[PDB]
Design a protein around this motif. Structure first.
Motif, PDB file in Angstrom:
ATOM      1  N   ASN A  53       0.819  -1.195   0.000  1.00 59.67           N
ATOM      2  CA  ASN A  53       0.000   0.000   0.000  1.00 59.67           C
ATOM      3  C   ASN A  53       0.860   1.254   0.000  1.00 59.67           C
ATOM      4  O   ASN A  53       0.403   2.332   0.367  1.00 59.67           O
ATOM      5  N   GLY A  54       2.114   1.112  -0.410  1.00 63.31           N
ATOM      6  CA  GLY A  54       3.021   2.242  -0.468  1.00 63.31           C
ATOM      7  C   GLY A  54       3.992   2.296   0.689  1.00 63.31           C
ATOM      8  O   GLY A  54       4.305   1.276   1.309  1.00 63.31           O
ATOM      9  N   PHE A  55       4.450   3.504   0.995  1.00 64.32           N
ATOM     10  CA  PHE A  55       5.512   3.707   1.973  1.00 64.32           C
ATOM     11  C   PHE A  55       5.002   3.744   3.398  1.00 64.32           C
ATOM     12  O   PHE A  55       4.214   4.596   3.774  1.00 64.32           O
ATOM     13  N   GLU A  56       5.471   2.794   4.188  1.00 66.92           N
ATOM     14  CA  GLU A  56       5.089   2.719   5.571  1.00 66.92           C
ATOM     15  C   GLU A  56       6.331   2.880   6.425  1.00 66.92           C
ATOM     16  O   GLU A  56       7.435   2.544   6.000  1.00 66.92           O
ATOM     17  N   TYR A  57       6.128   3.428   7.617  1.00 61.84           N
ATOM     18  CA  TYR A  57       7.176   3.612   8.600  1.00 61.84           C
ATOM     19  C   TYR A  57       7.321   2.359   9.470  1.00 61.84           C
ATOM     20  O   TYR A  57       6.394   1.964  10.186  1.00 61.84           O
ATOM     21  N   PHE A  58       8.488   1.731   9.404  1.00 57.32           N
ATOM     22  CA  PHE A  58       8.751   0.528  10.187  1.00 57.32           C
ATOM     23  C   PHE A  58       9.571   0.883  11.408  1.00 57.32           C
ATOM     24  O   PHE A  58      10.780   0.795  11.382  1.00 57.32           O
ATOM     25  N   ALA A  59       8.886   1.264  12.481  1.00 58.57           N
ATOM     26  CA  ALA A  59       9.495   1.999  13.587  1.00 58.57           C
ATOM     27  C   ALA A  59      10.154   1.134  14.639  1.00 58.57           C
ATOM     28  O   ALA A  59       9.967  -0.082  14.661  1.00 58.57           O
ATOM     29  N   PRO A  60      10.930   1.775  15.530  1.00 55.70           N
ATOM     30  CA  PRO A  60      11.473   1.076  16.692  1.00 55.70           C
ATOM     31  C   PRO A  60      10.330   0.529  17.531  1.00 55.70           C
ATOM     32  O   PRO A  60       9.164   0.894  17.324  1.00 55.70           O
ATOM     33  N   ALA A  61      10.657  -0.346  18.467  1.00 55.66           N
ATOM     34  CA  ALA A  61       9.668  -0.796  19.425  1.00 55.66           C
ATOM     35  C   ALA A  61       9.247   0.405  20.264  1.00 55.66           C
ATOM     36  O   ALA A  61      10.041   1.341  20.462  1.00 55.66           O
ATOM     37  N   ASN A  62       7.998   0.381  20.728  1.00 56.43           N
ATOM     38  CA  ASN A  62       7.471   1.392  21.647  1.00 56.43           C
ATOM     39  C   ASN A  62       7.023   2.717  21.011  1.00 56.43           C
ATOM     40  O   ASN A  62       6.347   3.520  21.666  1.00 56.43           O
ATOM     41  N   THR A  63       7.399   2.954  19.757  1.00 63.38           N
ATOM     42  CA  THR A  63       7.109   4.246  19.137  1.00 63.38           C
ATOM     43  C   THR A  63       5.608   4.544  19.161  1.00 63.38           C
ATOM     44  O   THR A  63       5.180   5.629  19.577  1.00 63.38           O
ATOM     45  N   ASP A  64       4.816   3.571  18.727  1.00 62.30           N
ATOM     46  CA  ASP A  64       3.370   3.730  18.658  1.00 62.30           C
ATOM     47  C   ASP A  64       2.703   2.418  19.001  1.00 62.30           C
ATOM     48  O   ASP A  64       3.045   1.380  18.435  1.00 62.30           O
ATOM     49  N   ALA A  65       1.758   2.465  19.937  1.00 57.81           N
ATOM     50  CA  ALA A  65       1.029   1.274  20.376  1.00 57.81           C
ATOM     51  C   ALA A  65       1.985   0.172  20.777  1.00 57.81           C
ATOM     52  O   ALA A  65       1.696  -1.008  20.573  1.00 57.81           O
ATOM     53  N   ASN A  66       3.124   0.571  21.342  1.00 59.49           N
ATOM     54  CA  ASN A  66       4.142  -0.369  21.802  1.00 59.49           C
ATOM     55  C   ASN A  66       4.365  -1.502  20.803  1.00 59.49           C
ATOM     56  O   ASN A  66       4.245  -2.671  21.142  1.00 59.49           O
ATOM     57  N   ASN A  67       4.659  -1.141  19.558  1.00 59.08           N
ATOM     58  CA  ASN A  67       5.004  -2.124  18.546  1.00 59.08           C
ATOM     59  C   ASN A  67       6.400  -2.668  18.828  1.00 59.08           C
ATOM     60  O   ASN A  67       7.054  -2.240  19.784  1.00 59.08           O
ATOM     61  N   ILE A  68       6.861  -3.610  18.011  1.00 58.83           N
ATOM     62  CA  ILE A  68       8.233  -4.097  18.144  1.00 58.83           C
ATOM     63  C   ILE A  68       9.120  -3.406  17.092  1.00 58.83           C
ATOM     64  O   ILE A  68       8.592  -2.746  16.194  1.00 58.83           O
ATOM     65  N   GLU A  69      10.445  -3.527  17.204  1.00 60.80           N
ATOM     66  CA  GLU A  69      11.325  -2.850  16.254  1.00 60.80           C
ATOM     67  C   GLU A  69      10.961  -3.206  14.812  1.00 60.80           C
ATOM     68  O   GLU A  69      10.478  -4.304  14.546  1.00 60.80           O
ATOM     69  N   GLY A  70      11.173  -2.262  13.896  1.00 61.71           N
ATOM     70  CA  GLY A  70      10.921  -2.480  12.485  1.00 61.71           C
ATOM     71  C   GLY A  70       9.515  -2.950  12.153  1.00 61.71           C
ATOM     72  O   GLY A  70       9.306  -3.572  11.097  1.00 61.71           O
ATOM     73  N   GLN A  71       8.566  -2.670  13.054  1.00 57.10           N
ATOM     74  CA  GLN A  71       7.154  -2.998  12.854  1.00 57.10           C
ATOM     75  C   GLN A  71       6.423  -1.801  12.295  1.00 57.10           C
ATOM     76  O   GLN A  71       6.340  -0.769  12.953  1.00 57.10           O
ATOM     77  N   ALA A  72       5.907  -1.919  11.077  1.00 57.22           N
ATOM     78  CA  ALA A  72       5.133  -0.831  10.491  1.00 57.22           C
ATOM     79  C   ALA A  72       4.194  -0.249  11.539  1.00 57.22           C
ATOM     80  O   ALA A  72       3.725  -0.974  12.412  1.00 57.22           O
ATOM     81  N   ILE A  73       3.913   1.053  11.463  1.00 57.46           N
ATOM     82  CA  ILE A  73       2.966   1.652  12.415  1.00 57.46           C
ATOM     83  C   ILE A  73       2.069   2.768  11.872  1.00 57.46           C
ATOM     84  O   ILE A  73       2.458   3.548  10.976  1.00 57.46           O
ATOM     85  N   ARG A  74       0.866   2.849  12.434  1.00 62.65           N
ATOM     86  CA  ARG A  74      -0.011   3.969  12.133  1.00 62.65           C
ATOM     87  C   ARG A  74       0.737   5.250  12.472  1.00 62.65           C
ATOM     88  O   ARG A  74       1.347   5.368  13.532  1.00 62.65           O
ATOM     89  N   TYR A  75       0.689   6.197  11.546  1.00 66.82           N
ATOM     90  CA  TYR A  75       1.491   7.399  11.617  1.00 66.82           C
ATOM     91  C   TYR A  75       0.933   8.265  10.509  1.00 66.82           C
ATOM     92  O   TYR A  75       1.326   8.146   9.342  1.00 66.82           O
ATOM     93  N   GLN A  76      -0.021   9.113  10.891  1.00 66.61           N
ATOM     94  CA  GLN A  76      -0.788   9.933   9.968  1.00 66.61           C
ATOM     95  C   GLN A  76      -0.369  11.392  10.021  1.00 66.61           C
ATOM     96  O   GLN A  76       0.081  11.885  11.068  1.00 66.61           O
ATOM     97  N   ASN A  77      -0.551  12.068   8.883  1.00 64.94           N
ATOM     98  CA  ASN A  77      -0.400  13.507   8.760  1.00 64.94           C
ATOM     99  C   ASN A  77       0.661  14.121   9.662  1.00 64.94           C
ATOM    100  O   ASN A  77       0.333  14.898  10.564  1.00 64.94           O
ATOM    101  N   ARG A  78       1.924  13.791   9.433  1.00 69.85           N
ATOM    102  CA  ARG A  78       2.983  14.366  10.250  1.00 69.85           C
ATOM    103  C   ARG A  78       4.390  14.036   9.733  1.00 69.85           C
ATOM    104  O   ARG A  78       4.587  13.106   8.939  1.00 69.85           O
ATOM    105  N   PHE A  79       5.359  14.816  10.180  1.00 65.07           N
ATOM    106  CA  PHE A  79       6.720  14.649   9.715  1.00 65.07           C
ATOM    107  C   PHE A  79       7.385  13.530  10.466  1.00 65.07           C
ATOM    108  O   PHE A  79       6.814  12.959  11.389  1.00 65.07           O
TER     109      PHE A  79
END
Length: 317
Positions: free
Chosen positions: A231-257
């Motif tokens: 579905n295009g470019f997703e942010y695969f963030a560190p653990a804990n960034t959003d909804a306490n995901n794990i490292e390199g786990q794509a995450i919801r991240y809307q309208n922002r830098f």
């Protein structure tokens, strides 16, 4: 040998004495059929043995479509056969044929295949019977079938005790435990959670989803950055960034830098990073098609015309 005299089939040995049975010729081995057998044939004549199966006091072979003596490595009706290719007896066991080391069972004369334990040493073979160098699956797991002289140096094709270290072969990445067997699934090696293809120990590379969760791996390890997806470019963030995901786990991240390591991106409602010219806050940005990384730090050639960006990526007109 196969010397026809007076319209018959006279076969003679090395000293030149009549022969009876199935002997070699310019066409191949032919049955000197007694009288009668086909079309009132003479005694000791060879004419027709069309598409059957022959036996000579112990030796056997399979016959094919062309009525002639067919030989070689076969697979009839899903059954593999290998009878002496150029003789009446049988040739099995190791046979380096054109660089490829094939093996044939000494009992059933069939090209042994797959994870096979030969002489107390378990090699591996593909469906073609060819010797498959590499890391393949066994009843105890994946064993590295290495070349000649490797671990407590061995022979080409015999697995080796490969312990507590990674394998690079070559783009392919693996890792073997203490049991000398390759790793599979999620494996913390020196603090780092890897993931290994349960089907091939292949340390996963590229976009992946496991247990309803997306990760973008590279060399077994999930990667941290903004990479492409389904579905295009997703942010695969560190653990804990959003909804306490794990490292390199794509995450919801809307309208922002997000400033991530000297690169910069914009994410929209859908939570995907943007691409191409874009005006955020009345400041013109250009984020690369293939990266989503903002253009910043200086001069960039874009669609044939070059633009200068600031460290923050805003085009300075």
């Amino acid at each position: 040998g196969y010397t026809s005299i007076n319209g018959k089939h006279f076969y003679f040995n090395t000293d030149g004495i009549m022969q009876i049975g199935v002997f070699k010729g310019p066409n191949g081995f032919e049955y000197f059929a007694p009288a009668n057998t086909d079309a009132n044939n003479i005694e000791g004549q060879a004419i027709l043995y069309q598409n059957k199966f022959l036996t000579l006091n112990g030796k056997k072979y399979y016959f094919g479509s062309d009525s002639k003596a067919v030989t070689g490595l076969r697979t009839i009706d899903g059954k593999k056969y290998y009878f002496n290719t150029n003789t009446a007896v049988a040739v099995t066991g190791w046979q380096t044929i054109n660089g490829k080391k094939y093996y044939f069972n000494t009992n059933t004369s069939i090209a042994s295949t797959g994870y096979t334990i030969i002489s107390g040493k378990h090699f591996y073979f593909n469906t073609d019977g060819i010797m498959q160098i590499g890391v393949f699956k066994g009843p105890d797991g994946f064993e590295y079938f290495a070349p000649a002289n490797t671990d407590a140096n061995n022979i080409e094709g015999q697995a080796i005790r490969y312990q507590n270290r990674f394998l690079y072969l070559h783009d392919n990445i693996y890792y073997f435990g203490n049991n000398s067997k390759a790793a599979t699934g999620w494996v913390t090696i020196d603090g780092n959670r890897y993931y290994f293809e349960p089907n091939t120990a292949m340390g996963a590379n590229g976009y992946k989803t496991i247990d309803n969760k997306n990760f973008y791996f590279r060399n077994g390890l999930p990667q941290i950055g903004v990479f492409k997806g389904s579905n295009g470019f997703e942010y695969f963030a560190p653990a804990n960034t959003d909804a306490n995901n794990i490292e390199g786990q794509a995450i919801r991240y809307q309208n922002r830098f997000l400033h991530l390591l000297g690169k910069i991106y914009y994410f929209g409602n859908n939570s995907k990073a943007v691409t191409g010219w874009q005006t955020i806050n009345g400041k013109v940005y250009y984020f690369m098609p293939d990266t989503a990384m903002a253009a910043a730090g200086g001069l960039f050639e874009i669609d044939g015309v070059i633009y200068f960006f600031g460290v923050d990526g805003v085009k300075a007109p």
